[PDB]
Amino acid sequence: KTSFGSLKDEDRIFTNLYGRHDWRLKGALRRGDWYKTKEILLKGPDWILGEMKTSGLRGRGGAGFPTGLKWSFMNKPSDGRPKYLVVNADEGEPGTCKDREIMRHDPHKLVEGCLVGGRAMGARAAYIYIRGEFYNEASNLQVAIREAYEAGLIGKNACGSDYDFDVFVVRGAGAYICGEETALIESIEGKQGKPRLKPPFPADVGVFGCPTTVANVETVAVSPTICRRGGTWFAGFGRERNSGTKLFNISGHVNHPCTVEEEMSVPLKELIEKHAGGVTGGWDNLLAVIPGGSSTPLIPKSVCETVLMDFDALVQAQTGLGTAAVIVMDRSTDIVKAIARLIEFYKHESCGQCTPCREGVDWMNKVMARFVKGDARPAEIDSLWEISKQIEGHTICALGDGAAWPVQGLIRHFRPELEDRMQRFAQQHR
Amino acid sequence: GALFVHRDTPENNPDTPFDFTPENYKRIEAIVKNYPEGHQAAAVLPVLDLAQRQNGWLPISAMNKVAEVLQVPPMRVYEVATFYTMYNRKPVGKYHIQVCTTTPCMLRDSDSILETLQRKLGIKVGETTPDKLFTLIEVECLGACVNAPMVQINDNYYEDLTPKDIEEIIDELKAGKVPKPGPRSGRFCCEPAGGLTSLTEPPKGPGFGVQAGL
Amino acid sequence: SNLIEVFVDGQSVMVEPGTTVLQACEKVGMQIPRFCYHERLSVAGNCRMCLVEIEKAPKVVAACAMPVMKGWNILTNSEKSKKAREGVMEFLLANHPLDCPICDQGGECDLQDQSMMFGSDRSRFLEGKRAVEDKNIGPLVKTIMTRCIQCTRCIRFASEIAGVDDLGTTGRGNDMQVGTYIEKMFMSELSGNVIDICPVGALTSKPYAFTARPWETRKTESIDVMDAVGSNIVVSTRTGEVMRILPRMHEDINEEWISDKTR
Amino acid sequence: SGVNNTKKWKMEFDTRERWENPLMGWASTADPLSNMVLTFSAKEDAIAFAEKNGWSYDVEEKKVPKPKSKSYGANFSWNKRTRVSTK
Amino acid sequence: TDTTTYKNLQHHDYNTYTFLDLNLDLSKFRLPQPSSGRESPRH
């Protein structure tokens, strides 16, 4: 099929997204969670790892690697070390709020996917690293983790299966980089959130030096349903190799900014116009949209008139789905002063470990501040462009990558605005 | 702004008295049992956060005490406390007002929310009111972008503000009342204000759509 | 009988499994640029000066950490490798201070010398520089930390060779600073060796400061008698006068270190 | 860290007295061979040159750095002392 | 069937030690942690 949208309310995984119905154990049961789990655990890992493979699920954290293949690196005989699952609730990228709702309104789907996903990987426990600012969501999660322990759903002999499993909530201390998979692993270890190099890959040397898998909240929180409702059912949504539903955040200059769940590959215009109520001042007032959090390049109105919302449609437009966080800007915005803020954010978030992001991201920040003020020369635009190509691809982790793409996106599509401010500054101060 | 070198002063030195209360020692014993034996060093963050929650900031004596309890080099605790922004190494007010200014909030007049808090409290970002009651600073995306603008006071979120609304929260705090966490525009969470557009039907109960043969 | 075969610019090398790209190039005689890596410290991998192109791969691997895989062609001098070095050297120097005339490293600075061999000849950095306040860590090692390139060699040496876990990094991002946070003296019978392993003038010798330049000095390869270990040393002299004692490498005795008494 | 001054063999002469010039304090010498430094490609070429010239020589064997086992992944060992406590 | 109010309100009463008290109750249900085999890497 070629249409994608108006997802039926029967096919929505996060049936309690808005927190209207009860989130505690007595309610998550009435909505299907923890149902026939003992049947799922006894089916083995090769069946669960076959469900994730078939569904074409790709990690929702922001890199989009196939979830089934990735979780199979931990499907190996043990060498005497414990195996661990680390759910990434760091929720750090600007524009994205999806993971917040799962931990606050549907925590029993997150605890269940930790068991289901952990069983597939042969893990003994799950560490749920949540960002330190989400103190109330963490408490919700701890209250639900207690209830699933009291009822026997996790812990010793979970769901009467034979498997023993633990769920630990570890609270972060306020750093966007600890959401990086290997920085996260180091933070759980009592160190600074500095990412590691690869290899070794966490599937060999991970948390505490043990084999580890890091999964996003939204990635794990849908593993139980995919096992319950089948691989093919989740493959029925979205284009080939872009399967499933998705949590879309729409923010910025929309009428009704909101978090909604929608099918994958829905056209960006439909996503804004239906669920968000449209751009402020009309669609024609649209200037540019960041299709997935501040890391991804922006795109102008022309490319937003037909582009879909999935990992491949947005890659032909020179951007990415990222976290599927949609930030909209209308003509009254100061586009250059808005991207220059993303650089201040990446400049303020860089761990400082490796040279290109240490100096480059800060250096790009200093330059972008002058473009905003207008105090530069049109020959610096190609200089800044190049300085970004020396950050991208040379850093330990992908933050320097994500700090370079926004600058590339602005230069690609909004150069005349950069070169028209610089005129007004020269004349004004001649 | 802030400095990552500590110089002793009469009100912050290795002899400023800090100790864990006996009911915050039973809590530490439970933090340290979350990690494999031999890797107790993984407990530095929660325990170093525990000291802050019991004192509101981290004197150099507090940090030297987490080190003694967990048996790590003190420098390894100094690295942690200086790395993460939530550890207050300089004393702060009773209420720590954090205003988000990253792009999603900036597009919704987060400056106005900031401009208002400056005049109402009579301070500037980074300062602390002479009452030692309020501390105002900007921050980065606090994860509630769809409900911008928003502030965090201590451990709560006050979303969807309008310059009028934040003023209300600064008086309930002066009056000693608790200003009720949550949005401020009628809607309760992240749903689209103006009625729902999704999840209208009642949820679909247990056993729905379950594949055959399971 | 497990020596895999790798290629360095085409020439084939039989290396043990576990050898890195950087050690593979040692054997064909090619030395990779570096700052953070040191053969006697744990691998760190943050300076990114060793980025090297592997044929048919798009990204560049860190030569000092990437384990080598059989059938690889390491292109130590391709365009990607040369451009990674130029870009990286360009960042290292962006916030570095114009200190070479007043710096005790000048004339024997890995940052000066690798900027001449692998970096560019221009500056396109038109901003202000950072400046970090100095730390007083004892009477032997002078710190002028604006010259630090945050390579963490001092941190790894102190931790793993001296066993003195007192140097570390505080702060974060471009504000990240090496040191001790508090005011501690880095006193140890092996502490003077940070002067050698620090690749720049951030950590230099107080007793030796300002007294000579490297090109001036004559090197006499002698032995140390302050103890019975017989550490191999080098004695720099200038115009009939002893300037400083340095370690001479001897694997079976002192490796590359000497006690502070010797130094 | 460069190793490019460690490839060739050198021939140097024993140090002789230097003293201070009475007028200026410069370093005076009566040794004509104090700044003589011959370069050779092989240990054998350097010995032959000294032999045919009658200089008594003294040879020291090349000190190469022994090959070492590196491993970034060793910094995170589940149970070995090589687990570093800081990056 | 309600779905017209907000049924996540318990967080209006969490205090400064909530997360750390639940973690203390949960300590009875945990399983014996694995042991590397040494007290620490010996800092």
Ligand SMILES: Cc1cc2nc3c(=O)[nH]c(=O)nc-3n(C[C@H](O)[C@H](O)[C@H](O)COP(=O)(O)O)c2cc1C
């Ligand atoms: C700077 C940075 C921040 C990241 N933050 C997050 C995050 O807050 N949540 C997340 O699920 N992934 C985040 N990621 C991506 C993770 O590294 C990784 O892709 C993800 O945890 C893998 O889990 P997945 O299978 O669901 O994709 C981040 C990456 C970078 C470079």
Ligand code: SF4
């Ligand atoms: S790219 Fe930035 S955040 Fe990532 S490791 Fe390097 S310095 Fe740290």
Ligand code: SF4
């Ligand atoms: S360390 Fe000293 S000599 Fe080397 S580049 Fe810096 S200022 Fe110049």
Ligand code: SF4
């Ligand atoms: S002081 Fe020297 S050795 Fe230490 S991190 Fe800085 S440049 Fe490297």
Ligand code: FES
């Ligand atoms: S940008 Fe302010 S909460 Fe995300």
Ligand code: FES
């Ligand atoms: S020498 Fe390899 S990154 Fe520094």
Ligand code: NA
């Ligand atoms: Na030095």
